[PDB]
Symmetry: D3
Subunit: 334 residues, 6 copies
Amino acid sequence: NDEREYLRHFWHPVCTVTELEKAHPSSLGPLAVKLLNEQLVVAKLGDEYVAMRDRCAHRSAKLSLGTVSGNRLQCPYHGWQYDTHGACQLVPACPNSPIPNKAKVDRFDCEERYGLIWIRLDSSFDCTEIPYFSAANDPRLRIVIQEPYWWDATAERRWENFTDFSHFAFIHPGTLFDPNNAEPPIVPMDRFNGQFRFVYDTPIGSFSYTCSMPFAINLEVSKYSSSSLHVLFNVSCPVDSHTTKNFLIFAREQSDDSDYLHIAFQDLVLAEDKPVIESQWPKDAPADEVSVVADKVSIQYRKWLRELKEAHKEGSQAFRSALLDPVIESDRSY
Amino acid sequence: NDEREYLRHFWHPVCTVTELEKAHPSSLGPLAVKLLNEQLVVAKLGDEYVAMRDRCAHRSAKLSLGTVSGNRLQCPYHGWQYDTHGACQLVPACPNSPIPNKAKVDRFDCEERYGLIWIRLDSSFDCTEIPYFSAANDPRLRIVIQEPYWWDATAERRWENFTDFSHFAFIHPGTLFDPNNAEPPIVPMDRFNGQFRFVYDTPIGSFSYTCSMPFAINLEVSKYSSSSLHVLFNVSCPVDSHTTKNFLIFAREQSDDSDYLHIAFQDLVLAEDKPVIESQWPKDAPADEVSVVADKVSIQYRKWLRELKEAHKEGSQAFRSALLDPVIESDRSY
Amino acid sequence: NDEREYLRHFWHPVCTVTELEKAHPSSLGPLAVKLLNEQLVVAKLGDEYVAMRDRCAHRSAKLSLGTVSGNRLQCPYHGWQYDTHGACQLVPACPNSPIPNKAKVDRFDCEERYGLIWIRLDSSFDCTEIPYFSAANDPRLRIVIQEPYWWDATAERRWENFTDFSHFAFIHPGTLFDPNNAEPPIVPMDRFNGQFRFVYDPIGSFSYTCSMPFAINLEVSKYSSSSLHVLFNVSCPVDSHTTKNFLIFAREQSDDSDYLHIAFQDLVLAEDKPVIESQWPKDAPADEVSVVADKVSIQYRKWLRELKEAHKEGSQAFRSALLDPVIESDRSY
Amino acid sequence: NDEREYLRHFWHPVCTVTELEKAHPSSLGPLAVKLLNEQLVVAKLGDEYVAMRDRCAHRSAKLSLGTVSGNRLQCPYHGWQYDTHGACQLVPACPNSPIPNKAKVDRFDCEERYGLIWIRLDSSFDCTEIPYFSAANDPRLRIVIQEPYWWDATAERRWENFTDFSHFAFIHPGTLFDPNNAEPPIVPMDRFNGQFRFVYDAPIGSFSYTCSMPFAINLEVSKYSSSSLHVLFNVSCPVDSHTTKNFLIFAREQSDDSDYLHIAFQDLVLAEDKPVIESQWPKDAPADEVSVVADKVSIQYRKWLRELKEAHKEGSQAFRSALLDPVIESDRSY
Amino acid sequence: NDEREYLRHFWHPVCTVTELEKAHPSSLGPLAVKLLNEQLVVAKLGDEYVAMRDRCAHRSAKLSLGTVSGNRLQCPYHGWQYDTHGACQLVPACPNSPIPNKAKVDRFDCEERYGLIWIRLDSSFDCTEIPYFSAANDPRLRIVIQEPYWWDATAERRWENFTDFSHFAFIHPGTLFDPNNAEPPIVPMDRFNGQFRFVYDAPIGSFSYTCSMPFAINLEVSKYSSSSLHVLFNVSCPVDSHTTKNFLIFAREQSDDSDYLHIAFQDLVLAEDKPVIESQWPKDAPADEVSVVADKVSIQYRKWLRELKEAHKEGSQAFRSALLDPVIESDRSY
Amino acid sequence: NDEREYLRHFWHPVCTVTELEKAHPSSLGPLAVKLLNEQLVVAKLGDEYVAMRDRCAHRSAKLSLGTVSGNRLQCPYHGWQYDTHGACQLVPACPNSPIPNKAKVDRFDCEERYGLIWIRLDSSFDCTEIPYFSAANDPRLRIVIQEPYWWDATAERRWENFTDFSHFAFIHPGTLFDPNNAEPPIVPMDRFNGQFRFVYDPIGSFSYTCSMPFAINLEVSKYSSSSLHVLFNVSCPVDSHTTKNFLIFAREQSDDSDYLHIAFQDLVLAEDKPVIESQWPKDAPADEVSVVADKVSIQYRKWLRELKEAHKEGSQAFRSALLDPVIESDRSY
Ligand SMILES: Cn1cnc2c1c(=O)[nH]c(=O)n2C
Ligand code: FES
Ligand code: FES
Ligand code: FES
Ligand code: FES
Ligand code: FES
Ligand code: FES
Ligand SMILES: [Fe+3]
Ligand SMILES: [Fe+3]
Ligand SMILES: [Fe+3]
Ligand SMILES: [Fe+3]
Ligand SMILES: [Fe+3]
Ligand SMILES: [Fe+3]
């Protein structure tokens, strides 16, 4: 728990906009979500997406069992009404008495982007941004948001599974494995603007990764001589110590085919990964795991996470430098 | 059964395009559907949506358990390949022998329109068209296709439920009932181009019905002084003697709000109707039902159905006249 | 199909009063019930229990999905209101217009007795009565109405199971079998007032009063003691293969727990249930082979056959077949 | 936790007499019950209801799987028989040998009252009594004992829910809320004989509460100029740290109507409360909850419970005074 | 329908001996079984397996709920005891009275062979025998009786599935399909002694079929220059018009490996067939099915079944000739 | 937690050979098993049954989701291949590079005997053996391995249930209770070769050879007859509250059905199961009260305590506590 405090400083996705709209017939929420083992409630009050602790200040009922009425979230028990800042503005039992100063619940940064709702629990370092999705606002690409998928595995283990190629022959022999490539070689990895950037050439094409730390991956798959750009954007919500809620958004230039051709293929790949990733134990990678040279991406990821954790302990400027300082291995200029 | 043969001459919806694409990972089908108690299979072969009897000519296996490979539907048992016309073009066991002339399955009219797949089982009268949806190709309106809903009631009983107002105070008191209107009066009903056309004024607005016989309803709800056009398009697939698969498509001019605000409200209305309509017995309306003057729409609907049934027995020209001749009660010019 | 028509002339229980009051939060019903494959609705309108066909005259919705509103049963669909005679008295869409003459639904005899609701589908012969329960109005006895139990067996087969002793050694060896009696003898059987009456004994007594066709009143008494126990069992013939069965029991010594008796009765029923449900075909064919020990069921089947034949001959023949006395015993009635 | 030790000194209901009689075919029990996380067994041994620890002294089998034999409880495993004092009186394997001195199990004060079975786990302070039910032995009233209901909420939170009126508009708008009363004013509350007493009302009627501390509530509802007395008696069994088994007994003077009219209504009320009360978290009310002036009853209840917990730590005399000393703020003469 | 009458003249398997022994704790049965829509009961009475109608002559209870007592089957209801001939020999209620002449139930020819129980419902033609299993009494072979498997398909369609090779590439591509063989050529088929005999093969091995009409298949798979004989014996019980209970027995010369290697493989093969065969409709093959030259085995099978059905209508002598007359088209000397 | 460490020194059954062969279509495994709360994987590599920790050294995936490939167990994730000693011998991503020294997983003793797979987690004291089953290699007897049965009870409580006669009247009144014996007397108990040996009788004999700590070999013989019946029951201590129990039975007269015996044994187990599962806390506390009839369990508990204490003293103390003879009877060994 002590181990995870630095993660409160990043933006994490908690639901799709669709999930929020489907939660209650109002289409405005509320929706209960859980992030880093914190119980939160999300709602649309007026034009704004709001995130609060899911716990009424009065008698601790869950506001996620309440009702959105315009610009208020009403508690289901004694009807206290909370505004967009988390402050109670109506105590129905005492409508003329002054509202206690303590009648407020914690309110957190909450923004929509790419069709997902993002929450940042701690904004005090003021140096993190919502992860980068390269296909946003590209009018050449059709964008599809998949339904979220829940895994009994941590966000770190999910991230390392997504960026590893070594497992293709064994987990994805008929779906992703390329017998003409088999073992892609180690590549240079750059840190830039709080992202890992690395590229694999096929060259006939390229797999270009832009990974916004700590849990988001933007993968651009391109081919020359063809206009066949495909973008996969994967991000894991660290729900608690053993669970992730995962979001996949994909974009494609050739969009005359069915969205479900791609959804079904992506779901097959995920079904192949799922039982093996969920089997990994203990849930957090212990020091006794044995790496080999082909594990470069995982090794460098673990190293940067540990540096962020240590920098968080030293405070805001140390964290901003650990996250945002460039570290270039490649021949590229950014 | 004898009673339902005339319905084979109309276009009936059997699935959404989404359902077809989701059926199999290929995104091309096949999908088993049932229409007028006939077992059919739908697939996308090349650019074309095809509908065939779901029964291989060889040993009667279901083609809906097979596989679409480009422009062929392959039977799952001995791999006979059927083309878009229902004709077997490959017998894998006898690849050099001539294919028997009998190695063909019945192929039916099948067209996509409005995001649904429509089938017409008998095209011999050559005088029916896919029902009219007024919001198609209107760029002012956002269109949403709901997931189909299955009811243990007939298409006729569903149609009469959708066009009746008398039940609002009792089934829809908090959703659709207007205590300021309560009992809308009987209105003139026109037959034109195989549609029932009738309008109710509110006037502050109007509910304008265009009902393509026998089972489709297009309802335009408009208000003057506001750009608040709403269109509801409801059509029932007569699956068998006691079941319907129902499709709702809705369009709206003011589209800044959530689609799920409307979906949830429409689902609530449907949940209020469902148990009462499913309770009606026997499933087909018998002669002993007692009508009152407020039942005009239902009475006139039943009369036109009976005329179509009788005209079908007399043949193509009689049916075309029964369906397409105008019969005007209103002051309108069409 | 036609061979059960004569059963429509009798009163049959369809539910407990408790089931009716629990069906809807108003405690007035309506409750859907099924009797001889007829779909019926029961409701309490004012002081009257009413039973109608569960089908509105307008568009055939089930009235059992509707609401009781004072002296009316209101259809859930378009709100037609039916009075206690099954006649529509309000068409909300046309409140001024005359109500069509056809706007009526069939209404059936419906009466509460003993805490059960009874329906008689055909009252034309005017000669049947609600079965006799001997403990009613006896202040010495505590009466308990058990929850109904459903069996995949006909009412005739259930009746013959209840009145047979031959099966105790094989079905009830630890519960009802008496190793020192084993084979109770054939006893005389009387027909009186539409009831079979017979008695099995100088210490005790098992006294049966069976109101034809499906009700059994069993009085168990012990001489030199005041320990009267009454069992009243009656089967509702729901359809051709199903019964809904009611058991009411009364006892003089009532300082013990009701549940001592309920648990024992439920154990006995659970022993009978799989064997009776296995009997096939559901209705006893003419090829069943009887022995002398089967006197009760032989006589039962003979009287039922007489009632079926008399029903075809009409009202007076049926009244005679049902109510004429036929006395085998020494007892005076 | 050890914060609960003081509750062991009170009488708590564990089952209805009906539940005991139904548990076993003999109608004498045994029945397993749980109270303050203790596993107990109840049985009728002769003319007495007896409560013992549900654990045989021999090899720790549950006596609740055993049988009542005469006036003793017989273990299911090797047949040891325990008397009403928890002492073993027969060891079937060694019938003539002396029974070990330690062959005994703890027993607890156990009494029937009002059709419930009550247990007091710690009788050493000897100053608590079974709670007061005002309708007992009043022949004008028909009494109905409802079946117990289980909630995932503590007895303290259940008590505060039962005595609060503030929540009616939000949880019970169609069942209990009175639009013409809305917010009853704060009333004086008296402590007398281990009970909270307070009354709500020219006044037409009265809501008169007698609350036997800590978890029992007797509510008399009367109407002046009418003879329609209604009594609700509600008491929660604290089963463990997060669970209650709850008993409702209701009495009414006007009794020609159906018991199930009232049972259905009470069940609807409970179904409305249940999800909101179960959502309150953490399960025990923390110090950070925010009260308003309308919460007087809850505030005073928590204050008295705190006093009882502190007095328990100082011993029998302090506890007796904290419980039984009167504190009057109304003008009622007692 | 009455099209099935002729099948009553053959021996059909109804259960394994294992199933009979497991049915009841005594290991003697009774076991209820169903054959050609007849409800029967099987029991071990003394040294004999006996089949009776599952219906007591007294009050029609199922004897399969009863018990074997000595060498008799005792009804569960009033304890009548039936001997191996179906005759009642004890009426417990009337132990000294004469037993009614009609106190008897129909019994049927019933024999154990190969670890299965076989029943012949109509023995009046007396010209059929229990099917041939070639591995019985061959000490070189280890025999395994699989658990029966139930399919929603007729015995005729199951037989044609078992003997067809055409479907391997499509139903069994990873299990049975041989890319280097693909389409075995048509072979001569012999009728001899009520069996179809045909062999598939310088040739390395052999697939040798002996098919005891109508539903049993003995397949010997051998490899020349090796001692790896494998035998598959498959027989379908026609339970009713749309259901089969199927028995597979397999024998192998090479037997150091695990039985479950083979059981797992056979189960996978059956799981591949099952959905396709169950989809065939209507359940009985109609005249409109289209055969090709590769279907010789199925064509000849249907032709012989038609001859047996027609000969049955002409009587015992015609049936015996249709079944047992030889028709040789190979050059094998028998 | 620490009080069960000494159990790691014994051989425990973890599965039948049948369960291993059915786990994967290859019939070679792998199969996940749990023993003393350790997660293990069992597989057949060549002619050897192997048991490893179910956790790859690379990224901690479960090897039980992998595949046997000849003489290797292959991890499902990145395909590392482990030999019979638990050492990785192929890293497919780096086929030329040297394999890290840390690329090994723990490997445990694993042996087939009697149709069960046995694992010994700690072989350091080198003095324990797979329990004795007397019917093995006896051509006169037919041997049947039952399917394992899982109970929510510890292996010690299961052992004491199996060897107690006192409970027959109360748990097994219709199956095992003999009304003409009722209370079998205390008998002498011998410790020999790490087994408890004791005999109950001049017509018959119940002869127990109990290999410590959890295995029971029971020979039931009848003098002047050739009807030897052997029951071999052994409990796998899966975790702190669960056992996976194996029953093997052998009989001389084997012309009857295996299922006559299986059904009877299953009936006896179903009678014990709810009572044994109710015992709480799961491990017997020191406050349990014994009587003289409890001699078998008293002596059992004493020997287990001696083994636990000796384990703390080390290898020679444990060997002595386990294998030293302690003879109470007249018999010669
Ligand atoms: C007590 N009890 C419970 N069920 C019954 C009896 C009985 O006494 N006779 C009897 O026939 N039946 C069916
Ligand atoms: S708990 Fe939220 S208003 Fe009281
Ligand atoms: S059944 Fe379709 S190819 Fe044979
Ligand atoms: S169906 Fe009953 S009022 Fe219309
Ligand atoms: S455990 Fe209770 S008598 Fe032995
Ligand atoms: S029904 Fe079989 S003995 Fe009576
Ligand atoms: S986790 Fe086993 S090879 Fe990587
Ligand atoms: Fe993967
Ligand atoms: Fe409606
Ligand atoms: Fe009985
Ligand atoms: Fe409430
Ligand atoms: Fe096959
Ligand atoms: Fe036992």
